[PDB]
Design a protein around this motif. Structure first.
Motif, mmCIF file in Angstrom:
data_model
loop_
_atom_site.group_PDB
_atom_site.id
_atom_site.type_symbol
_atom_site.label_atom_id
_atom_site.label_comp_id
_atom_site.label_asym_id
_atom_site.label_seq_id
_atom_site.Cartn_x
_atom_site.Cartn_y
_atom_site.Cartn_z
ATOM 1 N N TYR A 90 -7.015 7.099 3.886
ATOM 2 C CA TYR A 90 -6.871 6.031 4.868
ATOM 3 C C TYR A 90 -8.097 5.126 4.794
ATOM 4 O O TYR A 90 -9.219 5.613 4.643
ATOM 5 N N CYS A 149 -10.340 -2.880 18.339
ATOM 6 C CA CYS A 149 -9.946 -1.488 18.162
ATOM 7 C C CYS A 149 -8.862 -1.126 19.167
ATOM 8 O O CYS A 149 -8.892 -1.573 20.317
ATOM 9 N N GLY A 150 -7.905 -0.307 18.730
ATOM 10 C CA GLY A 150 -6.797 0.057 19.601
ATOM 11 C C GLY A 150 -7.224 0.714 20.894
ATOM 12 O O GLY A 150 -6.470 0.682 21.880
ATOM 13 N N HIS A 151 -8.425 1.289 20.931
ATOM 14 C CA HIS A 151 -8.881 2.037 22.096
ATOM 15 C C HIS A 151 -10.021 1.341 22.825
ATOM 16 O O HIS A 151 -10.780 1.983 23.555
ATOM 17 N N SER A 157 -11.458 8.295 18.908
ATOM 18 C CA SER A 157 -11.701 7.695 20.210
ATOM 19 C C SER A 157 -11.120 8.527 21.345
ATOM 20 O O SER A 157 -11.357 8.183 22.508
ATOM 21 N N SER A 212 -6.930 9.789 16.744
ATOM 22 C CA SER A 212 -8.128 8.961 16.823
ATOM 23 C C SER A 212 -9.346 9.752 17.300
ATOM 24 O O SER A 212 -9.263 10.507 18.275
ATOM 25 N N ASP A 224 -15.517 -3.441 16.361
ATOM 26 C CA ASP A 224 -14.218 -3.560 15.696
ATOM 27 C C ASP A 224 -13.438 -4.707 16.331
ATOM 28 O O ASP A 224 -12.534 -4.515 17.152
ATOM 29 N N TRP A 263 -12.114 -0.452 11.249
ATOM 30 C CA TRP A 263 -13.226 -0.133 12.133
ATOM 31 C C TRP A 263 -14.435 0.321 11.317
ATOM 32 O O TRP A 263 -15.570 -0.091 11.580
ATOM 33 N N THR A 322 -8.702 7.880 11.956
ATOM 34 C CA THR A 322 -9.248 6.582 11.564
ATOM 35 C C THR A 322 -10.746 6.641 11.268
ATOM 36 O O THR A 322 -11.198 6.143 10.234
ATOM 37 N N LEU A 323 -11.539 7.215 12.176
ATOM 38 C CA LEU A 323 -12.989 7.085 12.096
ATOM 39 C C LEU A 323 -13.671 8.346 11.563
ATOM 40 O O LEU A 323 -14.862 8.563 11.826
ATOM 41 N N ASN A 373 -1.988 7.679 14.772
ATOM 42 C CA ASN A 373 -3.443 7.648 14.695
ATOM 43 C C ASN A 373 -3.986 8.819 15.504
ATOM 44 O O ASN A 373 -3.910 8.811 16.733
ATOM 45 N N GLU A 382 -0.267 2.488 18.988
ATOM 46 C CA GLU A 382 -1.522 3.024 19.502
ATOM 47 C C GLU A 382 -1.294 3.636 20.881
ATOM 48 O O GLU A 382 -0.480 3.143 21.660
ATOM 49 N N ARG A 436 2.224 -2.063 13.396
ATOM 50 C CA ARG A 436 1.535 -1.432 14.511
ATOM 51 C C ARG A 436 1.715 -2.272 15.772
ATOM 52 O O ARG A 436 1.611 -3.500 15.727
ATOM 53 N N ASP A 462 -6.099 -1.040 6.200
ATOM 54 C CA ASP A 462 -6.070 -1.787 7.452
ATOM 55 C C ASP A 462 -6.160 -3.290 7.189
ATOM 56 O O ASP A 462 -7.197 -3.775 6.735
HETATM 57 C C1 LIG Z 1 -10.454 1.636 16.714
HETATM 58 C C2 LIG Z 1 -9.187 2.494 16.578
HETATM 59 C C3 LIG Z 1 -8.570 2.410 15.184
HETATM 60 C C4 LIG Z 1 -7.959 1.029 14.807
HETATM 61 O O1 LIG Z 1 -7.806 0.796 13.578
HETATM 62 O O2 LIG Z 1 -7.686 0.264 15.774
HETATM 63 C C5 LIG Z 1 -9.459 3.977 16.989
HETATM 64 O O3 LIG Z 1 -10.209 4.137 17.987
HETATM 65 O O4 LIG Z 1 -8.897 4.867 16.299
#
Ligand SMILES: */C=C(/CC(=O)O)C(=O)O
Ligand SMILES: */C=C(/CC(=O)O)C(=O)O
Ligand SMILES: */C=C(/CC(=O)O)C(=O)O
Ligand SMILES: */C=C(/CC(=O)O)C(=O)O
Ligand SMILES: [Mg+2]
Ligand SMILES: [Mg+2]
Ligand SMILES: [Mg+2]
Ligand SMILES: [Mg+2]
Lengths: 424, 424, 425, 425
Positions: free
Chosen positions: D81, D184-186, D312, D310, D100, D85, D342-343, D308, D280, D221, D146
């Motif tokens: 992957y 970022c999704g979170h 986060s 995540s 991000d 981010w 992801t991270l 994901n 997400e 997404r 991404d």
């Molecule tokens: C920042 C996101 C991932 C993304 O690509 O939005 C996370 O917290 O996983």
């Protein structure tokens, strides 16, 4: 054999070509998957066709993709990529350098990629307009400068692979010491042994073999003017060493220069390259004939290359009738690739100096004169007066319309000033 | 503490009439704990500030390479323009040819600014080492550079402003277009953002300059003369120009009445948040330029203005020779203190190489010798690049080598060069 | 006649015992007509100079990314090492994996130094905006960076030195290898250049620092402990080590007798032209380190030395635990004031991800949750990156956004983040 | 008429259920006049297509360097992957550390994809030259990468898709956020674009793959689970979720009711225009994942989904150990056939180097020798990078040198290296 390893190679491509390595070496060293290098294949095979079909192939050194695009539009069949120009105004250190291998080794291949991408967009524009191309092909072959390989044989191997990935059709390597590399028409050149240059040439061929492409290799010798040699280890170089003179403080041997060591080196290099090139101090047809005849005694029909260098003062060296016939006469001798290394630099710098001087003196009058000259050149095939079309605005309009089913409210050309003010 | 203590090189009065959404204490909080100097940015910004107040006007040409900029300065121009259109066409970090739609990566403009300053730096090094003074007032002519629509939101405008400061740009311009639909000023399909949204971008640019500690100039550009679309009617200042009868487009955009009236309103709203104001226009119209200046100066007396003398106009189609000849002088008297031909470098480069390539195809070296003879002819007017080895710094690096080796290097370049022997 | 006036930030005595082939007038002639400041190069060089004179020794790890460097500084290390081997492996401008043979483009090292200083810059901006002081002495720990063999001749060494100064490096090291055959110090097949040729490289680097106006440190490295080849015997200082019975190789290289004796000779020859001296060695050997230090100091008392604590050694194969534990301390007392583990970033990165990937294949999210819990457990020791949004500057750019918008943005990131919601103590 | 003839490597059924805004004649008109092959993109897309239909599920970790990706593949993971981010944090073409928020230049993700494929290519070259076969099913594990919100409009999505294909990515994901306010999704402060606007981005990406001639996978997404803002209510499909009584924000954004319902509606609308769908989520919640899958599958039976996992999320705060252990398995059975942390690369890199640097400060070479011993101990599980010279290709380039010189080079590297001497089995 090697044809199986290089599937796009045409029949006879490697006639007379020797290799230090085996076909089994290539399979051992190329990895387990087939990766295609389409622009390198097409360019090398087109360059091979051109230098055997034309009376000669002439080219100009391009320092940008736009320069190369106009060369092809005007009908030139190949593009030259000069390391001198990369040093001057187009390298990956973002600096202006003299021609001494000071810029990073990726700069040449990055310029080749830029050129192929511009040609790619020009082809996309015309293909989308649906009326055919205005040239035989936009993908004119690029012959590119790899200088002295930026180090040893493995460095020559890497820059060859980088040019192939970038889509170059041919690559030249010279028998200078990389740490003291110079423009062919500067002083202070240092030769490497004949055997050492042959190793670089074989490194370049192994790179083309493992990439699977019939990329052309140009061997250049700097022995016409170079008076220094790193080492006398090679018995082929020893006849030219001035032993009574002793070595320099750096440890270099001093050699007798001129056409004689160039002929010897060229004959030694011939099995390991596709074209041979000798740098010269003056544009001299008699000297060019002497070199060609001597090479062809040992290697009949060998393809040669000739630098029609802007480092010569042409009207001082030659009268007008000789200037006019010069390339035609070289072609009949066997110089099938001829190039003006620094043409893009001189055109760019002269043109902008004169425009800037006229602009300072007369402001918009000076620019309107350029624009009117552009209009007048359209009858000869010039199109860039309509700059929005030239860079692909109409192409991306068509992309947008295909994405949106014709319904995008934000297309660019319909209400442009180009459409309104540049109508035929 | 005020903003003059945060920007030590700011001259007296630099920020007269300038408003900021943030405080001096915000700047201290956001700038980090260490002082980093941006010398070229300081020098250029202060030189540009002096020039636009003391000259009748400052005119510039768009440069697409360091060499082009060098010749502009050598010819006597006092400023350099950096065009995002030209970055898209032939000088961006995606190594592609693009139309002018913010398609290339956001670092490309600043990278070109760095190239330009690096070439000027070498030009200055060469002349300094020769020890006979400079042939120009300064090699570091200020660069006014294109930041398009900020490449996103206010934080993106903040980042590109800082990147231009690090590269040594003197002034940066931002326009009130939607970044995702950005166009050349003279293309159709432009979409405006709300007046308040562009003021946020301008405030972001000013905060970036403040936290970098440089008095960088900000040019606010409005595209409302031709734009017929607007992202949102949320701002009451934009509502009087919305065609509510028309309804929204399929993408959700509002349709607006374009022309000089919304340009005047937006310019007057932007004025406290920028150093110069620029309105894109569909034609080179002195009467329209006068009306815009007079309207702006009613609300903001003495406001400095900028004007695009665009190659997207057909100049002889719109104007007679007398009007073209006086165009920039008359604009300067109206208050247009920075005037620039955005696409000059593109047209000079492409026209020049097309014509050289065409002549080379037809007549080979005769065409190149004609260029070389024209170069020699231009030396009486200050052209120097015929001697290309000196131009790019070969003599400078010879001097570096001699200082390193205490004078004992066997491999210097100029002494035995063909340039020395053939270009006296 | 004074170089101090050409280098405004150089502290008193910076150039004691330093010789130069060029004059101060050469510098003025070659530096252009305008003053350009290189603030991070000034700050880093002066901080490094203070550290190596005040600490018992300065130790460092090779960082291959800005994030690695940030965590080194956060953990309390006072300097950062930038390894050309790691550039070749995983961080170069050809976007390729290379062995350590100067195969990548010459700009790659300086570009990584710029990345490192930019990460440290953001870390400093984050803490400055939070208004509670820094959690380190400074985020801008000095970077000592690898210029390999100069990527060519003296002019190439001149150029890479300038590039490192622009990128903010504090010190730069150059080795007496032939760049066209360059190797990692612990590979076979190294080719030396003549003593005089490396002195030219060192002088070129000093001229570069001088024309840039910065007191950047120069480290001279000799590879003579293991190199059995030499380009030329032209320098009489190298002739005592040439094996003339063996003759030249087919490439024309001379064959030499490698070991401690040519290292000592070259080190003493290089000493007036550098600030620290370094010899590559085949084993971590305290006795040999003392012999080298004593021999150099016999000629140049108090000369600062550097030592590579190389991952290319099998440490427990060579040494017992007690000697490993005291190794760096003992070296410091001999004069090795800059000590560095060249390939630490490579080994940490590759080991850590192999083991995480293996656990993830076996146990999926259980393996990742183990990492996250280990991160939580390290916070009491100063680890902060568990809160990755804060770590990369999301709070800093929120503060930028609020200053732009007068405090009234609908689109700030942290307030409704899962970090704020799920990572509270 | 036919798209399979335009994409010669596409397997039978590759485009079942896939709709396109454009025609096959459009592709021919827009693709230029010459066939250029994108071999890694073809192989990766086709391998990823195979994996997601044959594995119970394909799990991956976010790689921020080629070396990280190489160890993921060596450990037996089947895909890689590429996280934007992580590009922002420590691996982008502005050489800065960013949060991000689409701040870095749009070429950065594809440049990282190229780096990853290049490292994998070298790993394959090394093992191929050693002649004992590969130690993995393939080194060219498919990369899922991404593309954020496309970095602008549909033409920007078109361009980033082409760039990922040239770099050899196997699949690319695009999200329904406003590019100028991307998060970022979170993070909080997300802004949605209209359903129709995201479909245009998805169609732009498919047109890009079509003109490139590659069967590259597209992942759609949606960020509607937490986003409370929307650029425009122009699309009647979004209007049911608009809170009209709340009015627009000061910026002109509409305010929307977030949660699973707009995700389901958007996902169902996106489904004909992508190969996998991803929502997400605010927490790792198997029940919400099942509700989403069941609703998408009512409208589009068998549709492949992505999830994901995540960092986060605070995993142990949300979930007991049993649920963590079965999490990916349970998602796989629901149809989540591509699952990714992801991270992961950021947290592994930063945690590992913080703990190494802390131990080095406290105990110097003892801390490093502990890492080296851990490396040795991992060799029984397949770790190889303890022998770092072989790992980066020194033996491969030795073989290249020997082929060029017919066995005669004097300067090969491995025979007399300390690796050969001190790391013998
Ligand atoms: C920042 C996101 C991932 C993304 O690509 O939005 C996370 O917290 O996983
Ligand atoms: C500098 C040379 C060209 C080259 O590539 O050496 C010349 O003067 O043409
Ligand atoms: C494309 C414009 C210039 C700009 O920057 O918009 C023109 O036509 O001059
Ligand atoms: C490869 C060396 C380091 C160097 O820079 O030569 C080692 O093994 O530490
Ligand atoms: Mg050249
Ligand atoms: Mg523009
Ligand atoms: Mg090294
Ligand atoms: Mg992302």
């Amino acid at each position: 054999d090697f044809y199986s390893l290089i599937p796009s190679a045409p029949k006879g491509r490697f006639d007379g070509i020797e290799r230090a390595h085996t076909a089994e070496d290539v399979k051992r060293l190329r990895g387990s998957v087939e990766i295609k290098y389409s622009l390198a294949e097409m360019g090398a095979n087109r360059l091979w066709k051109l230098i055997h079909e034309e009376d000669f192939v002439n080219a100009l050194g391009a320092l940008s993709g736009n320069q190369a695009m106009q060369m092809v539009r005007a009908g030139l069949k190949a593009i030259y990529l000069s390391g001198w120009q990369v040093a001057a105004d187009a390298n990956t250190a973002s600096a202006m350098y003299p021609d001494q291998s000071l810029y990073p080794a990726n700069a040449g291949p990055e310029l080749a990629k830029r050129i192929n991408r511009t040609l790619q967009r020009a082809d996309q524009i015309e293909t989308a307009e649906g009326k055919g191309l205005s040239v035989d092909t936009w993908f004119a072959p690029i012959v590119a400068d790899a200088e002295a390989g930026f180090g040893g044989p493995l460095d020559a191997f890497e820059i060859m692979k980088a040019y192939i990935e970038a889509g170059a059709a041919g690559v030249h390597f010279e028998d200078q010491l990389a740490s003291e590399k110079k423009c062919g028409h500067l002083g202070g050149k240092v030769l490497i042994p004949t055997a050492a240059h042959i190793r670089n040439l074989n490194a370049a061929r192994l790179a083309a073999d493992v990439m699977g492409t019939p990329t052309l290799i140009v061997a250049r010798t700097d022995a016409e003017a170079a008076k220094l040699l790193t080492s006398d280890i090679d018995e082929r170089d020893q006849p030219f060493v001035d032993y009574e003179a002793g070595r320099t403080a750096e440890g270099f041997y001093q050699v007798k220069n001129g056409i004689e060591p160039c002929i010897a080196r060229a004959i030694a290099y011939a099995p390991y390259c596709d074209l041979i090139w000798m740098e010269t101090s003056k544009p001299d047809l008699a000297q060019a004939r002497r070199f060609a005849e001597a090479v062809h005694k040992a290697h009949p029909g060998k393809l040669l290359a000739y630098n029609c260098s802007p480092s010569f003062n042409w009207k001082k060296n030659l009268d007008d009738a000789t200037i006019a016939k010069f390339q035609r006469e070289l072609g009949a001798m066997g110089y099938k690739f001829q190039f003006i290394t620094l043409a893009g630099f001189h055109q760019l710098n002269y043109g902008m100096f004169e425009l800037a001087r006229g602009y300072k003196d007369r402001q918009m009058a000076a620019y309107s004169e350029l624009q009117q000259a552009e209009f007048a050149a359209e009858a000869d095939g010039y199109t860039a007066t309509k700059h929005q079309r030239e860079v692909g605005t109409g192409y991306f309009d068509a992309v947008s319309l295909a994405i949106t089913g014709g319904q995008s409210s934000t297309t660019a050309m319909k209400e442009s000033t180009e459409t309104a003010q540049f109508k035929p």
